[model samples]
Target chain A: ADTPLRLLSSVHYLTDGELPQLYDYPDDGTWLRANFISSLDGGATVDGTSGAMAGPGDRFVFNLLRELADVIVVGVGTVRYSGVRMGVVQRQHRQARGQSEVPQLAIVTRSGRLDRDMAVFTRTEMAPLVLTTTAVADDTRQRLAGLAEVIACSGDDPGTVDEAVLVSQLAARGLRRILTEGGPTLLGTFVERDVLDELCLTIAPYVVGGLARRIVTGPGQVLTRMRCAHVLTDDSGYLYTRYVKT
Target chain B: ADTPLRLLSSVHYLTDGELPQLYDYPDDGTWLRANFISSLDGGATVDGTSGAMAGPGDRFVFNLLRELADVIVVGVGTVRYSGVRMGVVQRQHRQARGQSEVPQLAIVTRSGRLDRDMAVFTRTEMAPLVLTTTAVADDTRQRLAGLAEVIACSGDDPGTVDEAVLVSQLAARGLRRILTEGGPTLLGTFVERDVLDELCLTIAPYVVGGLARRIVTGPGQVLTRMRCAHVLTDDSGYLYTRYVKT
Candidate 1:
């Protein structure tokens, strides 16, 4: 059972010379979505490194939300393992988006194992929003509470991450425009549940030639068809594609 | 009467530019003195208006410290007026500094007049170091104790800001390397009293024009004919000049 989603507009970029259209999402709206990638042949990794899959366009999209969106949402596993900076967007893009000041970071996790001293917590102007499950220990919660605004969300199924519950909780806290920069599982769950409204995909020139991990995996059914809303080029000669679920 | 005092160099920039060299300093030691300045030559303003003087070179200098510094130091006036972030310099610079993760901010202030609700206090990853005079009110100290390391300096002259006392106190606490980004008066006092060992000056192409203000202003003796030991030009062609007292 899927809802029919509409494509509002489509903007395309033919060459790689122009600057990518970074977003400045309005503060008074609920435009939350997840961003990720899969390969042309269907894998997301290049020789065990996710860095190859991340190109300038992906960075543009990543920084777009980081600059414009109010709260950036990421899984705790990604934060702890990947060394993420959860708060504040890039300075230049933030200035371009007229958000030189406002933007908070939101971390999504069922467990409380992320490093307290990570850049995501230590750097940046915004404090993090740590969304967790009741399974997290009270002491752990207390420790994290000192660093971020911690919220507990209900899971859809026992021992499963819940997207709707997390979204509602964030919305209640006035984080209407959220940016989800994810590892596969969290993104896959959101897409499978049909919770994400929009998707921004960056197609780099080079191909990752193996059946490594895809951008999303496990639990979610395949998307029927998503409407191509925008395609743009960045300075580094990459194609940025945006898709709205239909 | 000014005493020729030894100064410890401990300030770090958050950028990827060349730092000024304090003469006769140990290369292996972490005691390099760094000075931050704006392009407009107004030094730092009371209303946090350094952005008006910000340029490419300023950004370069700003990021340089992030990449190199172990600890960043500033006065309470700079903290309160400028809304300075306490720990983990901004990311791009932090990344360039190869240290995207670092500890708390150190603020030098005798009176606890800093706004408690400011993001620097409520949102920074590093706890702040509030350097206060012995005469600071107990109630005020207690209020800020939760957010900062409220260290009261001994032998502080009443109603006077003494860098010597503060430096001694910090040195005793093992904060040997200190980077002091001044608001003119602090730098003047440090230089005039011969407490500062070296000075790094970045002379921009365009002068601020008019006798508005110099970086260091004082009623005491003026620093004349300071010897320049090294000078470097950046990508933007601005001269980074390093100097020592003659």
Candidate 2:
């Protein structure tokens, strides 16, 4: 329980409590960081969910990022498939950083077809910010009236959500530090629009030999160069790497 | 010029001269280890060849593996596309390990279309082993008489090279410790046939955001579990990891 993380960048060891200081960023600006875990052979999931690929080292960093961000942005497809429930367990960690006990959960959906069975609708005290397009069905919009704050954030295309509008709408609400736990296509949108500021990827020590999806997949290519910020590894064989846009 | 490599497994520093001892494996077992380099975002290449993605540490480990192997096996498609020339520079490292001064290069091809412009045909002292199926053209086979030892290694199917026959033929020639620097499909063939015993992968710190190929791709899926043997890294932001089939 007392093993320290080996920081490869500076050749130092870090305790679990010291991660918040190492992962610090300016809270005044709107920064979008995506978190993902993949096998060494590039499989993002085991069977379907990312749970099988995640280890203790990954989960610690995963929750640590949530405690630092102001809001969590994700796609509705990932919300359904991954069963993502946005909540933070480090109450003192959030309070010390002037953040709320739990960061607000935001979901992007073009159709607004949210199911009531999702834990975000029933399990949390705060209402989620549902960012959708004008193509949302009337029934789906009305169903989430008391459940969420539905905001139309797309430009002309009703079937597609605009990336620029989504970022502006989130920033307009004073929720700047945006964190996206992706399903590949949503993360691709941010990268394609040149809005992704940082990527915190965890390389799990597994050789999942299949045709699983990668961490980023889109219709077109986005060849953005990135610089390595830091690299860390635990004794459990998971590599914690951070890369920032150049 | 003499920074030590940080071994994450033992939490110790290893000099460049000590890699041969750390990467040691049994010599008489006919081990097939595939080496590949990928970006942090899962890109196997930058443009066409994996050369653009390789760094200094990757090259150091790349040559170290070749110096330790008895023979290097690769597909002809990779030889044509990536311009792969198999030659070891570490003469003392090989001779001290009781190996030949240079390892034999073996190229597998389904058809016997040998190009004369390749360096293997023009620039080597040892004749390359051209392993092909019975589907080779008559003129192409006769054209490589003095340049290469053209051997047909296939069972029943003239259009496809059987994996069993290929491995047995290399063993019969006393090439036990085999190394395959893959172009993904050929490595997939070994994994699909359950012949790959170890994998030495280098994760370069780059976020190549495109639809590049993975290190292993094929017609079907092979969900093999692997155990992490060790992990090492240099100051230049490259991770050297070893995994063995569990």
Candidate 3:
């Protein structure tokens, strides 16, 4: 539970325990924050998963953001690859902040074919919201009856979900403090469509040099200017940087 | 000449003027330090080149690293791509520190075909050292007679220069304080071979989300653990990070 954190840019030095004060978001504002852990040399993963790249500092922020969010948005491919039940473990902390004890999981998918045996569905407090394309078969929707609520939000592209539609759909449900735990593809669409509000990126000290792709990978270039909100470093040399859209 | 730098670690708080103290290296040591500037969102370039991503703080440290090195090593592809004369402009500063007025340029090339009109050859104080493969034509070497000192240092592979050979060749010539200004390919080779001693990376506060590649791009995965020596920040939110091999 101890985070060896230190605020680098502030005139008034902040302690390790009070680090969450820097990450607090406005309750009513519709904010979509994407969190990603990458190596110092731009590697999003080490050995096929982001878990390998995440250190203690990265892990601290990972759970911290999850505790702060109202809904966790992710791609179904990531859900398949990781498949961990998106449940907040810090019940006391959430109660202290007057937030729900558990944050809802929202999985985005172009394909409607989802397996009931997926790990994300195992013992979830709230049923996951599956944001998919309208072209999905009725049989597939019936299969997700109790497992997830399938919201077909894609405008014409059955292969890819519209980012704007995804945002509005989540906003319609009053999930204002939106947090997306990306697996590159989902984050790429948000970046390409220019919907990402703030980015909380953790730069692990290790340089995993190879074809291990970056946090943002898509078809075209979207040059977004961001201003640094804060840069926090831990005892293990990991940098937790928060950048907001300028 | 004022650098708005502040050291974020250690008991001693380093001032803006003394920021170079953290980057000092042993004079007799055979060190290869690569300097690269990237966007906060892992983009190595903004518009096909690195210059667009660099802020004022990045440029300050860029020249600082060049001033600290004895030889500036780079790939010929980079020379053709960027083509700026890799000459040390801080003559008075170098003289003050007992360093050479201008650091020698060492360009690595697989193909020996180099142009006379390249911008790197223009206004160079020292004739550049062209490190190429052995299979280059004698006619091509003759053309670079006065322009550069061509040293064929590759082993069996005529298409690529061996990283080991490249290091030893530079060491043999007593050019120890090596600084490589990479164009991805050259840095990839160094990372792949595990010969890089240190890295001076500047993270500019801009997110250019595109197909802009990373600083390292090669075949295999080399998970190199590095420790953060120091993290410096300027008034403009640019992070200057120095990482050394653990």
Candidate 4:
């Protein structure tokens, strides 16, 4: 299963080019983008983690996504389950490429139950951020604040961060190039509010049919339409696709 | 948005030459292909039913899949929820073009709760079938028997038919070109048993964020790898993909 991936076909380009063509956006600065991977059988995770959906081509696409993001946002669940670390060199690599020191790690959490000990908070190239609500326990909120810049971005309700508030607040910070690595709930809200601008999905060639979850979950149905930006694939059967909300 | 579909790109031919090229089976006659449509976030149904997953592109592919099947298999859940009917013309369309008169509507159920008066059993070009277990009550079993041939394809255990046994029984009936439209659980068993041969997936542009089912559901992970037989898209951002088990 460790076989190397060979590029089979693509829509725009891969491994080379100014990503604006692939990951570009309008200057509105309000545009939000999301990325995810699923199994051929429509599963978002294999082992309770999207990491199980990983492949080399997906890695290349992942780095490219990080390379293009002003900030890489994630859900607290993803931070906990995936244990993603902000590589010390990742920002430097972006710096080397003349981008920011590195994409900031932004987290959206309601409970603020994240472990401060998680490397994603301690290890990165930039100061990590947490977007939560007043509903979080004061002690946990304070602890999370001590580790990262905490943005209380929820709605009238204290516990849930209004996706509109979260996106606009980030936009106010000039963090226009938004890229969300969803754990479903957060992405579900972005989609619910119709703030998402683009979607990049990788269809891995495996089927993990168990009690897993989807890429977006919450309440309500989002029948938002989109345009197929492009589709790409590799020898290993990993498919890369992009969509723009119309 | 009831707009006309425009083709974007494809790996193999579509709408030209024989459809056999698009959905050809092995001479070994052991192919078991399934099809499904999901939202970008992996919601297989828009509402509780898959009617929410409908679109013109999906319908096109759906008809083509039906045209290619020697028999269409479905779980009792799909049968009850969709209330499918057999069409004499369905196989006849295959016949006029020189395919089967219509694919058999194969249902796998445990309880035999179907109504004999339901159109699925009462109407169609071909007689629909039900595969169940000994668990069904005698009266109900007899009722189903009078409607459609009910094969007790499971163990001495009543209620549920074994997936493997059901598949083999259909093959023995000279119905090897099996196409399963899953309710997830039944499809999951087929994958867990490594009996599936191909998968055709359609990813629509919408994001149904609420709780919805996936195309495959069950215990244990089926990590079978597949090769991308093809990838295609329409201007509406609907993706059509085919995968063959590797």
lDDT of every model, 2 decimals: 0.51, 0.74, 0.76, 0.71
Maximum-TM-score candidate: 3
- Candidate order (TM-score): 3, 4, 2, 1
Q: Tell me the spans in candidate 3 whose CA falls farther than 4 Å from its real position.
A: A1-17, A81-89, A137-140, A155-160, B1-17, B81-89, B137-140, B155-159
lDDT digits (tens) for residues B21-95 of candidate 4: 656667676579988888877877765677666665676667667777777888877665233333665555677
Cα deviation at B136, candidate 3, in Å, is 3.0
Clashes of each: 21, 0, 0, 14
lDDT of model 4 at residue B181?
80
lDDT (Cα, tens digit) per residue for candidate 3, span A26-119: 6576888999988877888777788877766665678778888878998876776333234444777777777778788888877887888876
Candidate that scores best on DockQ? 3
Candidate number that wins on lDDT, 1 or 2? 2
Candidates, ranked, lDDT: 3, 2, 4, 1
**Segments in model 4 whose C-alpha atoms lie over 4 Å from true places:** A1-13, A18-20, A81-99, A113-116, A134-146, B1-13, B16-18, B81-93, B96-100, B134-141, B155-159
What is the lDDT, from 0 to 100, of the residue B200 in candidate 3?
Answer: 84
Write down the lDDT that model 4 would get. Answer: 0.71
How accurate locally is residue B207 in candidate 4, as Cα lDDT from 0 to 100?
Answer: 70
Positional deviation of residue B238's Cα in model 2 after best superposition, in angstroms:
2.5
Please give fnat for model 2.
0.22
TM-score for the A-chain in each candidate structure: 0.74, 0.87, 0.87, 0.81
Model 1 lDDT tens row, B35-142:
644221122321334454443555555544433455566655545523334344454444553443553456766575665666667766676677666777465577
Candidate 2, residues A14-42, lDDT tens digits: the string is 66666766567665678888889988787
Query: Residue-wise lDDT of candidate 3 within B1-246, one digit each (tens)?
Result: 111112143233344456567788766669989899887778787777888777666655777788878788998767763322334447777778776677888888888888877756776667888888878835557988778788877867866688888888988987788998787888888888888888888888877675878887777577888888877765567777889988
TM-score of 2: 0.82
Model 1 C-alpha lDDT per residue in residues A1-246, reported as the tens digit of each score: 111111111133323112333344544657666665533223345565456656544654575456656577876656652223334435555566554355677777777566677777776555677777756746456786667667777675534457788888888876777877676667666665667766665533332222244556553343223444444444433335455555
Query: How do the candidates rank by DockQ, highest first?
Result: 3, 4, 2, 1
